Design a protein around this ligand. Structure first.
Ligand SMILES: Cc1cn([C@H]2C[C@H](O)[C@]3(CO)C[C@H]23)c(=O)[nH]c1=O
Ligand SMILES: Cc1cn([C@H]2C[C@H](O)[C@]3(CO)C[C@H]23)c(=O)[nH]c1=O
Lengths: 304, 310
């Protein structure tokens, strides 16, 4: 049965992910911009930044923003979730360490819309922490060969590169850039903490008193008081949400791509990364062409 | 290995689901049957403040013309996330413990108060019928429904509308009662349709203008697929945009492996209980994955009922 290579390009936006994948038996599942601006709702990105902006100005309440933000993040992750669910049955077990018959490269993975954006919106005061754990609770199971490339880039360069490529309806928010860079850094540390033995239940005590300290993982974000009983204990619903998080994250293979360089560099740098990536068998002989059509149809209908 | 029986009682509110479930729990041994109740505490306090209240307010506001359809949708979508959270996290932590299908005396029986599809499909679809949710948001929820675990037995209810209305009349949205009753009937037809070999993509064109484990194959127009023939989901050539068609594939996939049964609630509380007790007979049980799964699951349910069912 053929082998497949799934590579999800993710991390904070504005570093070049789009220019990196563009330049690069290898199919692309691009940014679903048309779903965001038209198919799913009208100009979803504009509603998002408009709402953050208005919360900052004091024109609407925290509760007002959180509702718009949640509804809006549902519409943003839709294409990812639906792509994952129809693709999952075609993914079989691991290959190991030879040749990939097909290489599927995506623009983002479902955890960007289910975990990272919402956690950042939480850090911006535009989303409740209970809403973020509900989305974490719905993160599709992590299949073999879930390779996710996250990016490295000094903030100043990142602001520069972000400023020149502002999406339709987007606003250049530096507080949001900081939030999103911090979630992704926490994300990378979290996978490492978990791969290394970390038990969030065993180290929880350290947030109020060889692997990253729990204070450097996404778990610190969930010490939020909306999730805590009067005696300070995390309610069990939330603890189970964190257990899922540990289980979904932990088996992902994380890869760091340095974006502080020209798009030729970024593009080859990315292809270099694939040698330590994990590949999988597909489950049917006709699994490759179905994946390609899925990829072609997604691109044609939603990525412009 | 030891076997497990999971039963999800669902359907429209006000038919006697909760009562019936507890009478069934009552008959059993202290530890071989556990009840996972409605997570009201989560809906009123833990996930947000007075979510049910807020959902009814919004719907009345919209009915009144005091808010727009857009206002309405942002709120219902957001409220529905909070409504389904407990069901979603419970299924995700339970999943690892469920093994293959045995056959139709379990070491443990779990009776849940509704299934994850209640929050991710039925209520949302009905709010779409009430005009308070977009069909795109409903399909976004459908794409997130978790893989249907083996031995997923769902019990839905039959109750003549007049009796139902009578029970329920102690706001009282009669339009929401008809939407939720309509949604749950389509859902049973859908499972039957999918189990009888129906293929929505092959029958899509038959659209224009309940029994779940018995009977002939229903017409696609009597299944859930009909709710999605909306202009919003249609490309400028008449067909469904593929994103929406893929959401419908997940819907088929998630409902075809489910074992649905119908409980007649038009009877006394003990009538309901025995009825239900007879139906458990033909239900699918599964093996658990570890020796310790049983006790762990009992703890999970107890803790759930303690923290969130009241
Ligand atoms: C995935 C995602 C993106 N975005 C925005 C920010 C980003 O710069 C962008 C393109 O990546 C405009 C869209 C969110 O707000 N939420 C999300 O889940
Ligand atoms: C499960 C569910 C219920 N509800 C309401 C109606 C129902 O009568 C109820 C108790 O079951 C008050 C809460 C929704 O609005 N959404 C949902 O997903």
């Amino acid at each position: 049965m053929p082998t497949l290579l799934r590579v999800y390009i993710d991390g904070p936006h504005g570093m070049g992910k789009t220019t990196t994948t563009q330049l690069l038996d290898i199919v692309y599942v691009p940014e679903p911009m048309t779903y965001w601006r038209v198919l799913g709702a009208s100009e979803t990105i504009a509603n998002i930044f408009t709402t953050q902006h208005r919360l900052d100005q004091g024109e609407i309440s925290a509760g007002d923003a959180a509702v718009v933000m949640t509804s809006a993040q549902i519409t943003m992750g839709m294409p990812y979730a639906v792509t994952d669910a129809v693709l999952a049955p075609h993914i079989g077990g691991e290959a190991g360490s030879p040749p990939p018959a097909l290489t599927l490269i995506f623009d983002r993975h479902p955890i960007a819309a289910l975990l990272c954006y919402p956690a950042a919106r939480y850090l911006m005061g535009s989303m409740t922490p209970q809403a973020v754990l509900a989305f974490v609770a719905l993160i599709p199971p992590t299949l073999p060969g879930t390779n996710i490339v996250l990016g490295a880039l000094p903030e100043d360069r990142h602001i520069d590169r972000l400023a020149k490529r502002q999406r339709p309806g987007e606003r250049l928010d530096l507080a949001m850039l900081a939030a999103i860079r911090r979630v992704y850094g926490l994300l990378a540390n979290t996978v490492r903490y978990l791969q290394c033995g970390g038990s969030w239940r065993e180290d929880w005590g350290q947030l109020s008193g060889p692997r990253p300290h729990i204070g450097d993982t996404l778990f610190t974000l969930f010490r939020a008081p909306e999730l805590l009983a009067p005696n300070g204990d995390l309610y069990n619903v939330f603890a189970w949400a964190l257990d899922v998080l540990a289980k979904r994250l932990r088996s992902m293979h994380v890869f760091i791509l340095d974006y502080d360089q020209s798009p030729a560099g970024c593009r080859d740098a990315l292809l270099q990364l694939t040698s330590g990536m994990v590949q999988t068998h597909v489950t049917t002989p006709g699994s490759i062409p179905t994946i390609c059509d899925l990829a072609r149809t997604f691109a044609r209908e939603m990525g412009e």
